[PDB]
Structure 1
Amino acid sequence: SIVFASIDPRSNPLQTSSQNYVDIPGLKLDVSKYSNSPCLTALITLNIPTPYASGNNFPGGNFAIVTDQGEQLAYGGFTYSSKIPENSGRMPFTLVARYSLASNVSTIKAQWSNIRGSTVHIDSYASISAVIQCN
């Protein structure tokens, strides 16, 4: 089966300047129906196709896939190659993780954090999805 959530925060953009991972509003999968199933696995893709980060010390952004128990399943990020980008551009980002649905976890969600004091931004379509299969 497929589980999927998307956002498209054009009218009210998202941002963070947190050094620690915080939730991206709306980018959460409800896996309730599949909880406590030791024979199922989720293959999870976080798709942030159009982020950017503002700042003046080689800015960038980090993303993670995290369970509701705080288990970080995967992480990665983008950064620019100049200390002060002229106009920080859009650096497409995708991240893939897996999770055994044996546990009571009912939500798998996206988080983000900054780097070197940046502010990370999302103002357009992004998604999180999973394919759930028998082991």
Structure 2
Amino acid sequence: SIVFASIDPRSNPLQTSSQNYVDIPGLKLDVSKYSNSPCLTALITLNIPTPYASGNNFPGGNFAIVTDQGEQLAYGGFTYSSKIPENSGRMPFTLVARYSLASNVSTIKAQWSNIRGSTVHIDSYASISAVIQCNQ
């Protein structure tokens, strides 16, 4: 089966200047119905196709996929190659994780954080999705 969540914050863009990972609002998957299922795995894709980061010390952004149990399943990020980008451009980002649903997990969700004091921005479509399948 498929679980999916998307956002499209054009009118009210999202930003973070947090050095610690914080949730991205709206990018949460409920896997409640599959908790404690030794027979199931989720393949989770976080898609942030058009982020940018503003700043003056090689800005960028980081993203993670995490469970409600606080387990960080995957992480990565983008950064620019100039110290002070002329105008911070859109750097597409995707992240893929796996999670065994054997444990008592109920949520898989997206998080983000800054780097080198940047501000990370999302102002357009983004999604988190999972394909949940039997291990056989």
C-alpha offsets along residues 61-85 of structure 1, whole Å, 9 cap, x if unaligned?
Answer: 0000000011000000000000000
C-alpha offsets along residues 88-125 of structure 1, whole Å, 9 cap, x if unaligned?
Answer: 00000000000000111111000000000000000000
TM-score norm. by structure 1 comes to 0.99
Provide the rounded CA distance (Å) in 2 between the counterparts of 1:17 and 1:25.
15
Provide the rounded CA distance (Å) in 2 between the counterparts of 1:92 and 1:21.
19
State the secondary structure of the residue aligned to 1:33.
helix
1:49 Cα deviation (Å)?
A: 0.1
Provide the rounded CA distance (Å) in 2 between the counterparts of 1:77 and 1:41.
25
C-alpha offsets along residues 17-69 of structure 1, whole Å, 9 cap, x if unaligned?
Answer: 00010000000001111111011000000000000000000000000000001
| Uncovered stretches (5+) of structure 1, i.e. residues with no partner | none
Provide the rounded CA distance (Å) in 1 between the counterparts of 2:124 and 2:36.
34
Provide the rounded CA distance (Å) in 1 between the counterparts of 2:9 and 2:105.
27
TM-score norm. by structure 2 comes to 0.98
Provide the rounded CA distance (Å) in 2 between the counterparts of 1:128 and 1:34.
17
1:27 equivalent to 2:27? Answer yes
State the secondary structure of the residue aligned to 2:33.
helix
| Aligned-pair identity (%) | 100
Provide the rounded CA distance (Å) in 2 between the counterparts of 1:70 and 1:24.
15
The CA RMSD over aligned residues, in Å, is: 0.4
State the secondary structure of the residue aligned to 1:84.
coil
1:93 equivalent to 2:89? Answer no
Provide the rounded CA distance (Å) in 1 between the counterparts of 2:32 and 2:126.
22
State the secondary structure of the residue aligned to 2:103.
coil
State the aligned residue count.
Answer: 135
Provide the rounded CA distance (Å) in 2 between the counterparts of 1:123 and 1:90.
11
Provide the rounded CA distance (Å) in 2 between the counterparts of 1:105 and 1:9.
28
